Design a protein around this ligand. Structure first.
Ligand SMILES: Cc1cc2nc3c(=O)[nH]c(=O)nc-3n(C[C@H](O)[C@H](O)[C@H](O)COP(=O)(O)O)c2cc1C
Ligand SMILES: Cc1cc2nc3c(=O)[nH]c(=O)nc-3n(C[C@H](O)[C@H](O)[C@H](O)COP(=O)(O)O)c2cc1C
Ligand SMILES: Cc1cc2nc3c(=O)[nH]c(=O)nc-3n(C[C@H](O)[C@H](O)[C@H](O)COP(=O)(O)O)c2cc1C
Ligand SMILES: [Ca+2]
Ligand SMILES: [Ca+2]
Ligand SMILES: [Ca+2]
Ligand SMILES: [K+]
Ligand SMILES: [K+]
Ligand SMILES: [K+]
Ligand SMILES: [Mn+2]
Ligand SMILES: [Mn+2]
Ligand SMILES: [Mn+2]
Lengths: 445, 445, 444
């Protein structure tokens, strides 16, 4: 189970369409991809200036992510959590025969020359590599980490990188204050399960490639790199080996980001690329920022944690959802089977503790479909009284990229839209038409 | 421009579909209609027990209401407001030739026998007439009023009626405390402009039929009734002449209502029907409660007022929307071109004064599309800080049918999701792809 | 490492004192024990009406609980958490030689006759067994659970029991709706690590005796029961074998409980005792309700969870404390090394999600000693401004036994007493005396 096998699966399900007409990597790919967002993947067979085709939108809805993990939607968060608790080791494989080693390139590396790296949004500083998993080992303990980071193409052999302060930063800090570069490898064009695993949010020790291989049916085949002590998936379309230079900061950005605002420009670390390896006739994968693919990668991983955290406070939680309206981050909707009066407030506290990104939270009862915005809005309209069901907390920790925040400090709000417990059960009884699910309109026209 | 001409218009636009298979008026009509809600009108050609077909969903979206008023959507609220300020008189027409007089019936009236009156929701007390405009004159001044009222079929010649305390109640009170019945006429199967006008909310003096005839291209042709001193539209499919009996109260309801809850049963007025008149091969119109047709009839009329009221406080208001999530009543979204800091709070006050039904209000900037729930949710997620942008007012007047309310007393909430004025300008700049509207995906596959 | 070895350790440290004068089990034991609360254990050598002595206050402070787990205080919560994640199996041991089998008693069982079961607080319905771990197996899966439950003595061979809805209730429900009794065994007089493990709060599958044996240096020796399919610690002073009767409810309580208020009386399940086994010259252990022993048993277990939960929101949390003022439940004090402005509010949310019992929370900086009430009060006095550092949430889920609550619904409050980040930093510099730790008064 690799990217090729996944694109075939999409094509069999009618969720991949080919674009035969020529398209400019500057803006036209992003433009066309936005119109396909959530509906289908696009494979651009002819990208102006390049032999290599571009693909986008490998998974734009939660049903396809569930398929990528070989589960039904309803058990998706449970399986992701299970994969994080019981990682499965990978298999090292020989360089010869490994598809990613079909073409090695160690000299005169010019990334823009060889790869159709798109330029996505108007205010972007340049072309960006958006779908590369970044693999690295701790310089002390030797254990490896995977994360995804935007990479501005700033030269032939040179990338700017945004490293937020999580595990890659920890590694980089050790290398930097010992005067030494951090060796990395970037894999582009991998199976969605692998991308999803890069977003798993865990203890410091754990290898996300091992989380990925718990998600896939077979263990994940890896191969050693040419110029760095790092292993990469042998089935990847493209691999870029490099190192993050110590003490160097160059201006990266701005860049259109997940919340439909521009991430500000600033001096940030630099990758020097030491080799590129790829398949014969490789496919380039780009993730269009703010697309459903982008949002759900982080969203589903966050949701898996949110469910566990809410379960601690409210064991009878049924479901959780980080809405696309909130960039699958900021807004959370929890459904609970309420057993104790007050429980909804406690659920909201749990939602806030799941992540500092969570800003507004609404809680509804088990019967409300939280993946239908209209149904939750309905619940808020008719089951919330703001004087007793809303609370606001000022000046908590939020998110720097939310432009309403005061330098990452943010206010928070909770909305209890659950029915009061111990009342006449006919007061909030939602109207219904008997035999609705039994009858089907298509049978009558 | 009548109902027949409207159904033909729908059919020409692909928004009416026929259901040839037999359907039970008890539940199956409502069930099938719910699946068409917002997509298309359904004409049930074969209703079990009856020659007469049933139609539902004459207008399920705002574009079709705009078409029914012969305007583009963007000028719809302005035209409805204009029609209320400058009503146009109707034309009295001769009984012979008038289509609604083709079949008179003055004896052995059994409504359930002749008309396919559906039973809509599980907990409904019985079959209900849902789409009848009710016309009546003031016993003193003689000026007429139009409103729509649910009518429970409680006998062959007998209907229970809910009269909320507005203009029909005022008329009825005068008649009742003078010991006398109030003469009424019910017209079923009229043009959507006529229905929409019955919801216009005005000074006590004004005739909504005259509002309707300002909305239509020709003035509205009327004809005198057989047994009551009341005029009805000559083009109606069905007319039911009757009188509201003085001093009589019989149990009406329960009934599934606009907010997807059951209106409770109670003793209420009674209509005795004195005649029925109709076209040869009449079409019965039902409005399924809580359908888009139901919600938008009241919604658009309320929106027209909301716009004017918000304009008083904020002259640069761009748009207003009472959302279907709030039953086109409870939730309001206002867009303003903000000229003065603070303006959004003042807009919210105006939204509250438009109607006591308005409970939660969010204000966004001119560029946000307020008819897209995701775009307004996005604005709330990224441009609201609850500590300074939300306010809550306890124990105001709300709505009895909102079950969260304390006997019609309700809390209110306002959310200012506008950008602060006089700021750096690129902070809230929404990302974009240049040439997006110029490029079109269908041209590339 | 057993109870005997523990009492000797206490005596060697000067934290056990003997009471040679005669004492009434009705009220005088509780009264005297309350005055020793937190200072030392008391061994009552002469209890009016009985040969058997009573012991109380096996561990009244967190240093002694740490010692009972063979760790320094600073690593105590980490070790309890480690023991819950990696339970270690017990050793089944032969009945002969096992000290708890020295005296078996299967007939004419009269508990008040044989055991000096105290009556603790004024409004208590009677004598209560307060320190018995209760062991039981699931009727379906067969896996065992340990919890502590108050047991009213309502007859010679009969106890009333409060079962709150956790694991024992789950077991009991299965047995009850299949018409059958639930077999149990009560062990009294065990090592404090064992008691502490009975309070560990875990997944449904896990055996707390196995948590206890991870806490002890050697695995915990167990022995099969006489009349029930249940194992008990072979080293226990006293064991009471019995069964919880199906369909029977008898009035239990009232009883003075952890928050210094009376748990109300109500119809609850009944234990019929089928045997009693004990050592020759046994020691009876009682836990005085609301004592430090009582509070810290639950407190430390809750603290281990609270630390993990706060760590999720604030990875740089240093320490957590459920204060005795709040019955080691209701009030939480968190210390954090603050890295991001706002972090304290998020820590408070985590404190609330740890448990619905948590009502008021204060957060201070890493340098404040949160086990000194005066130092945290000082921090609140000088680093909190209520207008921006306090928040209140109305009508959340609380606790039924908190009498200020509206039928278990309770308001919550958070207090951020951390220094604001990015200020001068020398404004809040606390005064100090150089060479204070180097100098020692007893030397002068
Ligand atoms: C499309 C995409 C782009 C991302 N870009 C960045 C980025 O540029 N910088 C960054 O710090 N994190 C970025 N992330 C987030 C990390 O990939 C993610 O938080 C990851 O779990 C961090 O791993 P760690 O906890 O092992 O460090 C991105 C995530 C996705 C899905
Ligand atoms: C489908 C539908 C059903 C309605 N049913 C009722 C009803 O049963 N009772 C009632 O008082 N108003 C009902 N109304 C509202 C009145 O028709 C409306 O408020 C009208 O504007 C009142 O007229 P007036 O202002 O001239 O009194 C309904 C409206 C619609 C769109
Ligand atoms: C002194 C003491 C007395 C207790 N008394 C009771 C009680 O009477 N009823 C009860 O349900 N729990 C009581 N508990 C609580 C249980 O021992 C504790 O909640 C246990 O962890 C439940 O475990 P479980 O999750 O395996 O059921 C007491 C705890 C202590 C320290
Ligand atoms: Ca509520
Ligand atoms: Ca704002
Ligand atoms: Ca402070
Ligand atoms: K990761
Ligand atoms: K009207
Ligand atoms: K337990
Ligand atoms: Mn990681
Ligand atoms: Mn009127
Ligand atoms: Mn347990």
């Amino acid at each position: 189970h690799s990217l090729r096998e996944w694109l075939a699966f999409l094509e069999g399900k009618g969720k991949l369409k080919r674009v035969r007409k020529e398209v400019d990597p500057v803006f036209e790919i992003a433009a066309l991809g936005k119109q396909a967002d959530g509906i289908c993947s696009l494979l651009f067979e002819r990208v102006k200036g390049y032999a290599v085709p571009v693909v986008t939108g490998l998974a734009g809805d939660r049903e396809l992510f569930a398929a990528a993990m070989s589960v039904p939607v309803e058990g998706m968060l449970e399986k992701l959590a299970a994969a994080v608790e019981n990682p499965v080791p990978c298999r090292l494989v020989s360089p010869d025969g490994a598809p990613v080693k079909e073409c090695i390139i160690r000299e005169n590396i010019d990334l823009l020359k060889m790869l159709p790296i798109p330029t996505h949004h108007a205010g972007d500083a340049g072309p960006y590599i958006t779908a590369a998993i970044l693999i690295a080992r701790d310089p002390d303990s030797g254990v490896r980490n995977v994360s995804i980071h935007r990479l501005q193409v700033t030269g032939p052999d040179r990338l700017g990188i945004l490293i937020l302060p999580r595990h890659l930063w920890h590694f980089f800090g050790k290398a930097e204050r010992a005067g030494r570069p951090l060796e990395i490898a970037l894999a582009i064009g991998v199976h969605p399960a692998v991308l999803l695993a890069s977003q798993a949010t865990t203890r410091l020790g754990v290898d996300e490639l091992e989380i990925a291989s718990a998600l896939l049916p077979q263990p994940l085949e890896l191969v050693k790199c040419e110029t760095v002590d790092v292993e990469v998936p042998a089935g990847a379309e493209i691999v870029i080996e490099g190192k993050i230079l110590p003490g160097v900061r160059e201006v990266e950005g701005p860049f259109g980001e997940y919340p439909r605002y521009y991430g500000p420009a600033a001096p940030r670390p630099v990758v020097e690329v030491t080799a590129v390896t790829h398949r014969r006739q490789p496919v380039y994968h780009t993730i269009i920022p703010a697309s459903r693919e982008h949002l759900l990668l982080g969203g589903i991983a966050r949701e898996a944690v949110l469910l566990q955290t809410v379960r601690q406070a409210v064991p009878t939680v049924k479901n959780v959802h980080l809405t696309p309206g909130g960039s699958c981050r900021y807004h959370a909707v929890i459904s609970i089977e309420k057993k104790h009066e007050g429980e909804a407030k406690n659920a909201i506290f749990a939602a806030f503790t799941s992540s500092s990104e969570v800003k507004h939270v609404v809680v509804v009862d088990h019967e409300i479909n939280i993946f239908d915005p209209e149904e939750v809005e309905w619940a808020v309209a008719t089951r919330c009284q703001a004087g007793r069901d809303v609370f606001i907390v000022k000046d908590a920790m939020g998110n720097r990229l939310d432009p309403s925040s005061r330098d990452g400090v943010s206010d928070k709000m909770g909305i209890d839209a659950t029915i009061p417990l111990n009342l006449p059960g006919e007061r909030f009884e939602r109207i219904s038409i008997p035999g609705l699910d039994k009858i089907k309109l298509a049978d009558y026209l």
